[PDB]
Symmetry: D2
Subunit: 385 residues, 4 copies
């Protein structure tokens, strides 16, 4: 279960770099130099790193200081062979974003948020990023009167359309991935789930430029089934990127290492990504708990990749098992793949066996055999075969 670059495991600078400051507590760790993170991550077998503008270049830096920061980072990439597959903008930390970036009530803040984004897009492309992530963490409200949501969606569409116009006029080979979250740090966040984000994208001027970047813990904060949501994104052809972590249900955003939280959902998720042949980064957006020192930081990070690899092996074994293949036929998963009425509407309407002469009682008596299947899946996950 040794990770290698071929596994496409990526990490945000802000993940292993999180200092442990929470709503009730001061930082428990010193800041990590981005170049140190790059080197340590390369050693652990990571494919690449990702960043917010403000992770790499401290807010407010002069152009002189900005250029120095990028140069040191780029040297560390050159030395290690680490990739930068994705980047994103910090539109949530600075007090100016307290009511949003793209959907701030103040017009001047919205124009500022766009300019800050455009600037980092240029940098992302230059570094080789294929995906530009937007998490509108401050877009939303604590109170019902504070935000007219139809106007806010107009402003959100406007911002993303402008971003698409920018990218296409520059000739950039980069796509956008919108990251939904139901709440935190706002009471309610706009585009709260994968479904909301998918629906929103279809109203943009160029929908082909936009996908979703779903996060395990985000969807689980609404008590939603994360693999079901991923399946929908894949069904729509919009899974551009994914953020992997752990979450123990409906509560604050925990950002546990991948594999922690809902272990069975992690198993079904890996099963789905591997069998759908998802070929994007497996990005870990997580925080080593503030109880940990730096040794614990790197153990937590190693743990994320390790659990992914154990889960992949178990899922592959589950699908390869002919007893599982037999169980799947017994539960009629094969019949689910068959069209309901490839014979067409008229044939269906005239088919007496579909209704007039359908035996409802015989069909209702058929067991689904789902519990036996699920126990085979349990046995495999636990390696108790």
């Amino acid at each position: 279960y040794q990770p290698t670059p071929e596994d496409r495991f990526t990490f945000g600078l802000w993940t292993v770099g999180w200092q442990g400051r929470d709503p009730f507590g001061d930082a428990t760790r010193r800041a990590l130099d981005p170049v140190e993170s790059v080197q340590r991550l390369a050693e652990l077998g990571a494919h690449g790193v990702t960043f917010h503008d403000d992770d790499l270049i401290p807010f407010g830096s002069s152009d002189s200081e900005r250029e120095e920061h990028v140069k040191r980072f780029r040297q560390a990439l050159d030395d290690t062979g680490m990739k930068v597959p994705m980047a994103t903008t910090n539109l949530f930390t600075h007090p100016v974003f307290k009511d949003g970036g793209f959907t701030a009530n103040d017009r001047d803040v919205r124009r500022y948020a766009l300019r800050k984004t455009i600037r980092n897009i240029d940098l992302a492309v230059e570094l080789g990023a294929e995906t530009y992530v937007a998490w509108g963490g401050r877009e939303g409200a604590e109170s019902g009167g504070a935000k007219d949501v139809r106007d806010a969606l107009d402003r959100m569409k406007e911002a993303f359309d402008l971003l698409g116009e920018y990218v296409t006029s520059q000739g950039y080979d980069i796509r956008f991935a919108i990251e939904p979250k139901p709440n935190e740090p706002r009471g309610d966040i706009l585009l709260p789930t994968v479904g909301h984000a998918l629906a929103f994208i279809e109203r943009l001027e160029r929908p082909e430029l936009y996908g979703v970047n779903p996060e395990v813990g985000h969807e689980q904060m609404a008590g939603l089934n994360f693999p079901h949501g991923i399946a929908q994104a894949l069904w729509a052809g919009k899974l551009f990127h994914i953020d992997l972590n752990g979450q123990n249900g409906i509560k604050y955003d925990q950002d546990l290492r991948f594999g922690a939280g809902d272990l069975r959902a992690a198993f079904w998720l890996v099963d789905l990504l591997e069998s759908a042949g998802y070929s994007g980064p497996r990005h870990f957006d997580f925080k080593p708990p503030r109880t940990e020192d730096f040794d614990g930081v790197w153990a937590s990070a190693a743990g994320c990749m390790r659990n992914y690899l154990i889960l992949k092996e178990r899922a592959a074994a589950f699908r390869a098992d002919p007893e599982v293949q037999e169980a799947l036929r017994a539960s009629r998963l094969d019949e689910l793949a068959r069209p309901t009425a490839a014979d067409g509407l008229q044939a269906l309407l005239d088919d007496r066996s579909a209704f007039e002469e359908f035996d409802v009682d015989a069909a209702a008596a058929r067991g689904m055999a789902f519990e036996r299947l699920d126990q085979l899946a349990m046995d495999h996950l636990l390696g108790a075969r």
Copy 2:
């Protein structure tokens, strides 16, 4: 606060007709004759009634018995002037639907579910229904292996496309409204939220035929902001119908009368529907608690319309108050309506005031004045002005 037919208040036969059978308990009330419900509802000031096939015609009825049931009901409509604005199919009660209607693993069940739906569509149109609701209550799973979700979405799209082909080939003036629910009676239900349903509709062959029928308590079972979700549906032009009830957070589906549960969310919801000029039915999909006798049934039903009317008056007063108008300007809701960059991308890129010369500290120091606004909204809701 007397309801009249002009208020467009509707009720399902299954609402006031619910006998009080829950997962742990037997029925506490005798069954209500549909004709008695129609007459009692007319007396309370209702605009109309809605039905599942199986509410009006008991499952399994011969064509002879079916025709008798429809005749008695139609006579009661003729006598009262009550409308039937909406109908729907029961694809969840009979054991044959234990694994779904449209996305059952068994192909024969899927064809049956389509034929049962088509038959009731004919009846709905004949009675004057404008909206046909689909709640896929059994579409989903308790276990991860039981349902390949991409295949299930293929089957769900296939069923709805066939329904659209049927309706258009008959020349019917009826639209479909898909009703999302996150869970219950399945562990997870397909198209769990308003967002998921909106995104799904955009992949149908004729998206113009399909909208959403969101329910207050459904969205609140995922801890989502129901008014935000409605605003999105309205923004997309897809709010075809709405189900109103009450829910006390994330737990089982409670179906309290409208106004109970989250009272402040009810206020914001009524504010939004009235100010967006929603002109569809205000349908109450609720259950009088099984503690109640028939007198309590009709009091609960009256209560639904009464709370809507009190909330409408309070919301109207809130918006009419020039002190509220002043508070809205102070929180820059007016600036939210202004385009971010009607000057265009190039002008934005060249605008030094948007970035190079933007004063971030002055803009960050501006208070949003949201708490004062929210207290004005509280004062109005409570009539403490």
Copy 3:
């Protein structure tokens, strides 16, 4: 992983006997004869069975019919060596209990609830039950005015005190176990958690007669940590019985087979029961999903026992691993067991190393090493060591 009688696995008659009626659906399975369940359960290697009075004796049976039902049951126990370690009363199904048993607003219903309970205590004692469970599933409210909770707690105390007096006056060797549940089928149920039940017991006339019967899925419906609550019950000396099943989050009460739902919590629960040396029944209060025929019913039951046995093995291997023992020392689990100030208050007050000369920064910098420890537990759970 074969269960044998010495593993102390027990099942309610109502568990494998659930016909699959939910709030949205009719029964999918025919009724089981109690004697068939006993025999089938004995064949799977169960230790014993439990029952509500109404599972064994249909409601309102004459004394003559009552006798015939008990006779047939007793014979099946005689033939198999199956034990009856626990019994309980159904005070929730019949419409008369729609507002509660012990805490119904109507005094005549409360007396009847007590008499119905007392009758089944005699029977339970005769059959060999050591624990008498009480789940007050109807005690509570949907609305704030319906139940004065101080008065209701007086009535609840009164009922349990009367039951205590009854048992001690008969010289019965039977203890009560109160089963808490946050909600469903009432909007909120009284004594919603393990904590509320523990606190309540301390105010009864004979606290020594009463403990708790916590259920995995009940506490998880409040998003609480089930192993933590079980630890508190053990700490207090009050874990008289336990109900085991699975639950996926804060939602309706799912009753999945044990091991499904929150798998990691199930691991930590088995670890705790086994290391504390709990010696009571391992009772499965679950429902085979209504998708299943009878084969699926027995597959699901066997799965409960299998998952307990696998987790038991993995928890044992975890605790036995010298490398885990090393990690436990590294994380100072051993120091948690040493008294904070066995030297006393005066000694603590005079100890300068405790405050005045305490090096806060040196102690703050120590890593807890919790992540490495947790990954070892993960590796053991998955058999990846």
Copy 4:
């Protein structure tokens, strides 16, 4: 609705003084001087203020600086007539407490936690505090192996017993109030609910010295019914203090102003405190949202007190209404207060009308009339009577 000192409204220094740092954002407001808060709060009509040691005396101040801070504070209290009814210890902010105070795995940290607490008790007594609050916000875990909960409860008992010994040996008139919270900032916090805290107190050496300090939003984070939990605390004689604020569901800890969040629960809570005659402080532990400047801060604080006062009026009118009194009799609230069997066990056993001749069907048919009662409460709350 003007608050005056006799209404007993109090505020923590940390509430109006919150600078607006959350997990995703920097501070949006400058620090408040404690003396400015005292004065501004006195002007709004507050009764008193509360503090953590670290709110008043910056962490690690010399004894000389400590004295100067207390002196300035005491003078502001002297100038205004502001009381200090409660005080508490910060055992959560400093990195040293990252694994807890009283239940840290490191014994030296636990001793330091006790000494830090004892120092502030002396100060609290000197200032006139009658209640000493303890919120064990760091006591808990993110992972199952990190904390043996039985040992942790031993350490928690040990600490509270030492504090009890200290207070009684000094002859102080001060009582402890334990503040439960389900999660945040730890994954799960020990003593997660009002119930767990009540139960724990019964195992302390001097139970009479300890009660609870429940918070609206804490219990609501577990989806529990806050007025029910407060009723249980009152029933037990343990409601020593209360924290009032608002919370919208199971999610992160929001700390909205009181009256926001679950409005109906706030009505039922005010009804309960006022009719039980609670005479302790009405303490607001809330945070003005970080969107607000200082004007918004004081608007939000005034809003807390205003909403309490409006709800108090509506609850009083509700109880005083003869029509509500009639509805309470119709619903048998008065019968709930009569003992179930003051005639005794033997009399109940011999009473044939209690079982043998009890007409279950006649009692089952009685409606509870709860819906009509609840609509009257709704009408009163909204001023629609």
